[PDB]
Each structure stands twice: as structure tokens, then as C-alpha cells.
Design a protein around this nucleic acid. Structure first.
Lengths: 142, 99, 117, 35, 55, 109, 48, 150
RNA sequence: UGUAACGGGGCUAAACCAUGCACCGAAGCUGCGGCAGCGACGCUUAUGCGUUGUUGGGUAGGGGAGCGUUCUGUAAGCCUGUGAAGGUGUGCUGUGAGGCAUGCUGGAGGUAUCAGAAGUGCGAAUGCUGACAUAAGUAACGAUAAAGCGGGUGAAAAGCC
RNA sequence: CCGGCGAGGGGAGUGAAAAAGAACCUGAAACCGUGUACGUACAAGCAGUGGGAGCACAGUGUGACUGCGUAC
């Protein structure tokens, strides 16, 4: 008797919406990655996207403890020999505050084609309003 | 109406009229076999140590060997190689009673 | 008694190229490459008969952990609560219940939550 | 019609095996300084 | 200046993805002799655009 | 009725002939003929001789009716190579492969 | 007692070491000789 | 192997494997490595091992009733037709006749019959006493064979 | 060269210290089935087989068992044109080398068994011979004295006349 | 018959057999094609292996995604 595996057609992902105001970033970002992956479901199977669609709202109001607002640096390299550009947390909140949740969640999702598809179900909005009224997202209280 | 019993060092969850493959029991083909140690009978209503009087009674179908596994042992650069085949004995039982 | 060895070397080579079906490129056609493809593929098959019993126990434990947390308990307290209650169901069947008969799992969690605390 | 001529090799190498292999006279590779 | 590894059947045919010749599919009928010809070329019998040019 | 014409030991290389064969694979045999007529390859002159022979092999032996024929199968095999010697610098010699081919046109109503 | 029924005594015929015939024989790749020395050469080995 | 002892190419320099003879056994058309010579495949048998074997074969031929002792086996004309009859009444087809005398009439009459062998009680051997279905011995011959095996 | 001195994300506890409990975690241990070696067993009454104990990572190396191939006997025997060897599939089963059955090719030879003898098993030796790839339809087409036209012939002409 | 009074081929015929046609018994493998099924154009690495959908066939084929995994 083989162990149950969920199928990528019979899986039904539900839509959730999350207000990220005042939340600690990687405490927020690890429950997002838990439910993007689908580990909160008994139907979890590690080769199938079984997760949810999560709408993150008010991404710019996400919080970090300590001195991390001015001292957490985001390093990326551009492929050219100068390359090593860097932005602190408060510079990242000004330029693209959506990127802070998206970078933090992406390190917690698995690496490969599947974890790149689990990232597709994270809809991050800087403001207080999304466009996905038609998908009827339930409020997911963190 | 399924139940959990435990036969060949492993536990199985069977329903009625289902064949389950177990380890090689030494009872002849066609004999009713009781599994008095039933871990959990469930239905609309469930019963869970062991149950007190629920017995899975099955009926022995066939005594075969499994699909052959090749055991290959290899140690690179150390002049060592060892092949071995394995077919594992099983016993198929059709479940004819969940009490 | 000269012995020509074309017949039994063909068969010995053909036996190994038959075990190499589906392999990419010269690993299906060339004997030298296909021999150590087949020897490596038997090496992996030995190793992943060990890893199969771990990867499924990994998969059950991750599903009981999810299905316990829908019923409001962690995997650790559910497995401790089952052992204090002397329930001897293994994790293969505990995960099988968790997707197929959820109301037979909420009864198991209750029988664990009771006898734990 | 007198066809299916062969592949007449060079009359230099008497081991047709290496006929198309190397010239077998001098091997000049000159840049080796090891100290 | 020389390969370190023999390229495959895969990469040999991948390179010839652009070696495939392109057919014409654009023959032009002549309005006085009905001969098919290349566009803006004279015919095999030497008509062109209704006029006998070469003969 | 599938009608075969072959040209064996075609003196063009099979890779050169296979370029022209992919132009007339599946085409109607009238459209296949003037693709080969306005194709500027040597293999185009070789393959057109086989196709014009399979056209006559169909209508002389198996039947008739040129106009519903199609070039159903067209495939070029490698014939026996003729081995030749090019002399190179410093006494060295190379092997020239005069590569023959096997052109097969299968026409079919 | 026919020609296809006569057998030797048990253990009267040992087989004979066949050297250098693979991994399973226990005599392959060195021939029971070990690695590179004088005694592993053909004809090598010092006098009495 | 017919060839020259000339080293085929030089030892260094050319990137070909080093060779020193066109007649080496690695090479095609030169050299068997441990080539055969004509040899003697004879074995020594002790006389008490040879006589102990023949005494143990003749003891077994009376066990499996394949020894039949006659008192005379002779045939009048040197004709294969008569001997072909010789063993039909005797009910024999694959037989070895062992006589004590020098019967050349009987000796020619079984020279064409494939399954019939005539001996002279002094050249009977291991393989002949086994590879025939019946062994038939004249009474003058079994006196001599009893003697030489003591 | 690029964060580059938590593996990363991230963490103000997800860090340390003390205590406690649970859980995860190996090819370890246990369960279940199988196999082999060694003993102790008189358990049998050649002693196989059984019963129990315990052991089975292995290079060099030692010891013990086999498999298959060609050849001799067994063989004027058995198989074989109602299809041999070989080749190519498939299925079945042996712990393995392997074995068997058979569909298609093949179109005349093959050998149970038990012994016997070895040119007895190859992936490597910059091995040897043949065949065929690869680079690649790439480089080159051998003096930069130079060609252009119109007729001709021809299936076809830049090169022949 | 097609072709250049070619080469090669398709018939017809011989023959048990021409997939015995002379580049001729058997015709392996490398290597090269065609047809079909499936996969493949956001995905990183000894190319397998364990899990595994979906699809195509009548168990077989393929193998998305995924764990482990640096040939001899």
C-alpha cells in the first residue's frame, strides 16, 4: 500500500491575506514560507506545490528589532567587476519595500523549480489594498 | 470500515475484500488466518492499546517471491566488487472480516 | 584447444547494455561508459533502499505534524501523548489516517491530548 | 565495370596502421624550461 | 584550439538547427506562356513579363 | 501503393543530401519537383532524378495517377566511403573520405 | 560402471590457481604477487 | 614468428605506445605467448594399480551381469554374415569377444561390425572392458586372464 | 574577483547560562522474513538433515567452493530441414558467474550426462588490427600572370573546341 | 520503364530463397538516418537513483517536479 501523494491537479490552494504591519520580519516571513510550501496541510508532499496564495499587505510597515533598520545590509552583485551594490533596510523600505518581504521569504523557500513556483504565490503589496477581491482572500491572522 | 493490524513487523491498514501483501507467513494457501491483535478499527465510529474483541480474519491467497533486487557493492580504486540478488518471500491475504 | 571468445563476450556485453536502457548518450550504447553507469546505478540502488525508509518516515512525520497542528497540538506532544496512552500505531498508518479519514485522526489527537495532560 | 577501388596508402609507412597517424621522424616541441 | 571532450549527437544537431535550407514556395507564373519561374527572372524559354526577351 | 526509387552510391555526402531532402518531405509530388528545380545545390540535381524516377516507377508498374502522389518517405543513408590520401606539410599524410550516400524516395498515392 | 559414470575421489583433484582473471577469483590484478617490487616482476626474485 | 628484430619505431618521441618487436604477442600476426610444443601426455600407472583396476572391473562385470563366459566362440568361415548371426542367438549387439587363441577367421568376421571387438586376452584394457555392453570370454581365455591378474 | 569570519534566510531570542521534559535523528539496536559461516549438540545412526549458540565491512594476501567457453571420451548415442549453430527480442528463475523456454531472422549442424585437456573469460597496458565517429560541412582548394565575351559540341560549359 | 544509348533504380523472370544480384552465406557492435509515443524553450553540476504526477499504449514506454548523489 503506497503512501498518499497529492496531485498537482486535485490540490486546491486557498487565498489568504496578511497585514504585515508591525510584525517582526523573519517571524512573519517563516510562517509565510510554511504556508506557501504547504506544510500546514496534512496533504503535504514535498515534490508538489500544495501551499496557499498569500497576499501580504502593508509591507513597508514590517518591523525589525534591535538596530537592524539601519544595520541590516542587502548585498547583491550585478555581474560586472564593480558589482557589489548594497542597500540597508531603511534604504530598501524607501526604494522597493515589497522586496524586503520577498527577499526574506525567498531564502526560506526551497531552491529549484518548485520553490521558484512557491514564490509565485506570494503577492506582496506596499499599500493597504490589493487587486484580488475576486479571489476572496480570507484574513490570516499573524 | 477499515482496520489497522500488525503482522510482519509492519502495520497495515486494510478494508474488506482487499488483498494485502505481508511477510511470509507459514500457513498453507487457502487457510483462514486470524489477526487477533487489531490496533484500530474505524468506521463512522472508531475503536482504538489493542481493541478488545475486534479480529481481522483473512484468507491466504498466494506465496510468491518478489521482484528481484540487485545488490551491487563497489569500492572504487580498491579492487572490490560484489553482486547479489534478492527475491523476498511474501504472502497475499484477502481480508474477509473486520470485526 | 583454441577458444574464440566472440560469442560469450557479446553476451556479457549485451547483458550490461540491456541494463542501461534509458541512459543518456553513450551510457546506453558504449560498453565502457554503460558498464560504470550500471555499476553506479546499482550502488545508488543499494544506498537508496536505506534512504527510502528514511525519506518516507520523513514524509509521514511531516504530515502527522501538520495534521496534529490542525487539531491543536504539535508532533512531539502528540507522539508523547500516544505513548503515554499506550497506542502503538506507527507513523505510516498515522499519516495514512491523516489524509484519508481526518475524523479518525481527530479522535487519535483527543486520545493523545487527554492521556498526555 | 572495374569498380570498388581501394584506399591506397602512402608508400612511406610500412605499418598502414600508423600510415595516417604521425610522420615518425622528428618531434620538435621547443619551449621547455624547467630550470 | 582543440576540444577536450567529444561533442555529442545532441550538440551536433543543435548546431545544425540553422543549417536547414529554406524552400522557395514563390514560383511565379508568366502571363503569356504559363511557365513557372523565379520572381524577376526570365523563364526557361526566355519569356519575361509577357514579352519574349531572349529566344 | 508505396513506390520506391533508390539511388545508391550517390557521390554526394549524406549531410549535404539530407539538407535538400527536408525540403520535399511530405510535399505533393508536383510541388516537390519545382522545389528541387529552383534549389541551387548539387544534391538538388541528384534527388530530383530519384523523385522523377519514382514518379515513373509508380505510373509504369504499380498504377497511374501522377497528380495524387506525395513524397511520403525521403531519407538519405551513408554509403561506403572511398578512402583517399591528401599529402600535407612536412611529410604528413591525411585520409580524405570521399563520402557516398544512398538516396531513397518513396512516393505514394 | 560406464565411461560416463566414473568419478575421481573427493579432493583428489584440486583445481589450480588461475591468476589475473578478475575480482571474484581473488587472484586478479596482481596474481597474488602484491605491488611493485622485485618479487612481482616476471622472473624476478633473488637466488637461494 | 617470421619477422625482423628491428624495433618498429623509436622508443621516445613518437606518441605511439612503445614497441620493440613486430612479433610481440600483443601485436596482430606475431607471437603466441606461451606457445605449444609437442608433448607427452602419457601417465605412469603402477602395475599393482593397473592390475587392481582390471581386477576391479572384472569383479564389477559379474555384478552387473555383463560378463558372459563361453567355452568356445569360433566361426567356421571367415565371414561377417555368420558372426552377424553368431550373437543373435547369443542375443548380443554391442559386445567384446576375448579369446585365448589366435583365431584369424573370427578376427576378420568382426572387423567390419562396429559394435563387436575381438581381442586375444593379453590386450584387454581399461576402456575396452567398460565401453562394451557385454564382455564374452572363452573358457581358455578366462583361464589366462585369471592368471595374469594373479 | 563578490556579501564572504552563522551554510543561508533570518533571529533580541531562533543567543548564552542553569534546570527539566518531549521529540527528531544512523546501514547502531529491536521487530519481521530470508541466506550463509562456525561451533555445541549423538539431534540423527556413513551422517546427511534438524535443534541452539554466535558470527558474516574489507585492500594486500591466504583458504574453500563454483560458472561458462573450445576440444576428447561416453557418441554409428540423443537433438536436428516439421529448422542446428549464430544473430535479435521477450518471458521465466538461480546468492552469483549464469540457466532455461520461446517469437523473428538464419538455412546445417549441435551436443544431456559424467569425466578429461586447456591458446579458458578483457575496459584499461600513450596495448595490436580493422571499422567508424569527433572537431566540421569547419580550414583549405598549392604562387595576386587576369580575364571577358560570342559561336560550337553536349544531358549539362567559368574551365573543352 | 526512369536516366545522359549513364550510374543507379523499379518491374518482369530465374530460383527453395535475390532481405542469395556478383560491393553476393550468416550480417553483431560502434556509428548514421527515417517513422512513431512521451518529454523538453525560467532552468544550473558524474546525468543516475529513491519518490513521483501527467500522458501514450497494451504490464510497457516516457518522465514534469523532488530527496540523495563529484566517473572508472
Amino acid at each position: 500500500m503506497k503512501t498518499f501523494t497529492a496531485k498537482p491537479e486535485t490540490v486546491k490552494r486557498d487565498w489568504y491575506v496578511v497585514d504585515a504591519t508591525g510584525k517582526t520580519l523573519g517571524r512573519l516571513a517563516t510562517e509565510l514560507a510554511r504556508r506557501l510550501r504547504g506544510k500546514h496541510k496534512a496533504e503535504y508532499t514535498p515534490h508538489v506545490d500544495t501551499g496557499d496564495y498569500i497576499i501580504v499587505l502593508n509591507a513597508d510597515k514590517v518591523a525589525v528589532t534591535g538596530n537592524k533598520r539601519t544595520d541590516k545590509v542587502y548585498y547583491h552583485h550585478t555581474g560586472h567587476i564593480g558589482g557589489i551594490k548594497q542597500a540597508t533596510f531603511e534604504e530598501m523600505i524607501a526604494r522597493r519595500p515589497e522586496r524586503v518581504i520577498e527577499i526574506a521569504v525567498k531564502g526560506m523557500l526551497p531552491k529549484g523549480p518548485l520553490g521558484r513556483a512557491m514564490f509565485r504565490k506570494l503577492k506582496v503589496y506596499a499599500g493597504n489594498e490589493h487587486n484580488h477581491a475576486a479571489q476572496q482572500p480570507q484574513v490570516l491572522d499573524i | 470500515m477499515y482496520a489497522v493490524f500488525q503482522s510482519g513487523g509492519k502495520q497495515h491498514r486494510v478494508s474488506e475484500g482487499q488483498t494485502v501483501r505481508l511477510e511470509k507467513l507459514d500457513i498453507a494457501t487457502g487457510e483462514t488466518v486470524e489477526f487477533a491483535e487489531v490496533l484500530m478499527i474505524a468506521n463512522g465510529e472508531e475503536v482504538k492499546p489493542f481493541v478488545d474483541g475486534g479480529v481481522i480474519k483473512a484468507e491466504v491467497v498466494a506465496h510468491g517471491r518478489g521482484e528481484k533486487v540487485k545488490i551491487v557493492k563497489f569500492r572504487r580504486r580498491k579492487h572490490y566488487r560484489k553482486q547479489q540478488g534478492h527475491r523476498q518471500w511474501f504472502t497475499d491475504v484477502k481480508i474477509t472480516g473486520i470485526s | 584447444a583454441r577458444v574464440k571468445r566472440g560469442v560469450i563476450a557479446r553476451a556479457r556485453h549485451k547483458k550490461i547494455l540491456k541494463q542501461a536502457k534509458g541512459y543518456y548518450g553513450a551510457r546506453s550504447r558504449v560498453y565502457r561508459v554503460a558498464f560504470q553507469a550500471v555499476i553506479k546505478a546499482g550502488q545508488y540502488a543499494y544506498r537508496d533502499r536505506r534512504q527510502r525508509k528514511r525519506q518516507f518516515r520523513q514524509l509521514w512525520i511531516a504530515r502527522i505534524n501538520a495534521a496534529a497542528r490542525q487539531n491543536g497540538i504539535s508532533y512531539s506532544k502528540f507522539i508523547n501523548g500516544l505513548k503515554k496512552a499506550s497506542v502503538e500505531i506507527d507513523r505510516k498508518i498515522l499519516a495514512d489516517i491523516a489524509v484519508f479519514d481526518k475524523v479518525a485522526f481527530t479522535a487519535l489527537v483527543e486520545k493523545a491530548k487527554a492521556a498526555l495532560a | 565495370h572495374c569498380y570498388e577501388c581501394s584506399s591506397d596508402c602512402p608508400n612511406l609507412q610500412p605499418y598502414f596502421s600508423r600510415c595516417f597517424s604521425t610522420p615518425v621522424w622528428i618531434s620538435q616541441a621547443q619551449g621547455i624550461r624547467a630550470g | 584550439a582543440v576540444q577536450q571532450n567529444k561533442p555529442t549527437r545532441s550538440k551536433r544537431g543543435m548546431r545544425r538547427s540553422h543549417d536547414a535550407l529554406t524552400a522557395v514556395t514563390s514560383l511565379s507564373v508568366d502571363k503569356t506562356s504559363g511557365e513557372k519561374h523565379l520572381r524577376h527572372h526570365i523563364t526557361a524559354d526566355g519569356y519575361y513579363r509577357g514579352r519574349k526577351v531572349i529566344a | 501503393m508505396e513506390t520506391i526509387a533508390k539511388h545508391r552510391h550517390a557521390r554526394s555526402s549524406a549531410q549535404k543530401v539530407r539538407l535538400v531532402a527536408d525540403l520535399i518531405r511530405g510535399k505533393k509530388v508536383s510541388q516537390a519537383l519545382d522545389i528541387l528545380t529552383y534549389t541551387n545545390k548539387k544534391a538538388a540535381v541528384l534527388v530530383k532524378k530519384v523523385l522523377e524516377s519514382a514518379i515513373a516507377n509508380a505510373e509504369h508498374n504499380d498504377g497511374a495517377d501522377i497528380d495524387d502522389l506525395k513524397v511520403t518517405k525521403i531519407f538519405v543513408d551513408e554509403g561506403p566511403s572511398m578512402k583517399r590520401i591528401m599529402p600535407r606539410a612536412k611529410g604528413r599524410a591525411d585520409r580524405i573520405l570521399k563520402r557516398t550516400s544512398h538516396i531513397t524516395v518513396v512516393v505514394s498515392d | 560402471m560406464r565411461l560416463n559414470t566414473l568419478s575421481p575421489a573427493e579432493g583428489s583433484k584440486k583445481a589450480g590457481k588461475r591468476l589475473g582473471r578478475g575480482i571474484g577469483s581473488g587472484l586478479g590484478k596482481t596474481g597474488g604477487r602484491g605491488h611493485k617490487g622485485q618479487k612481482s616482476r616476471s622472473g624476478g626474485g633473488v637466488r637461494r | 614468428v617470421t619477422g625482423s628484430g628491428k624495433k618498429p619505431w623509436r622508443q621516445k618521441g613518437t606518441g605511439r605506445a612503445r614497441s620493440g618487436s613486430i612479433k610481440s604477442p600483443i601485436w596482430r600476426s606475431g607471437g603466441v605467448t606461451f606457445a605449444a610444443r609437442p608433448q607427452d601426455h602419457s601417465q605412469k600407472v603402477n602395475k599393482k594399480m593397473y592390475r587392481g583396476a582390471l581386477k576391479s572391473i572384472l569383479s564389477e562385470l559379474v555384478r552387473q551381469d555383463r560378463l558372459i563366459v563361453v567355452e568356445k566362440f569360433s566361426v567356421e568361415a571367415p565371414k561377417t554374415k555368420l558372426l552377424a548371426q553368431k550373437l543373435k542367438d547369443m542375443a548380443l549387439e554391442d559386445v567384446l569377444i576375448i579369446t585365448g587363441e589366435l583365431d584369424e577367421n573370427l578376427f576378420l568376421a568382426a572387423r567390419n561390425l562396429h559394435k563387436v571387438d575381438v581381442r586375444d586376452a593379453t590386450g584387454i584394457d581399461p576402456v575396452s572392458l567398460i565401453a562394451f555392453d557385454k564382455v564374452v570370454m572363452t573358457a581358455d581365455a578366462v583361464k589366462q586372464v585369471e592368471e595374469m591378474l594373479a
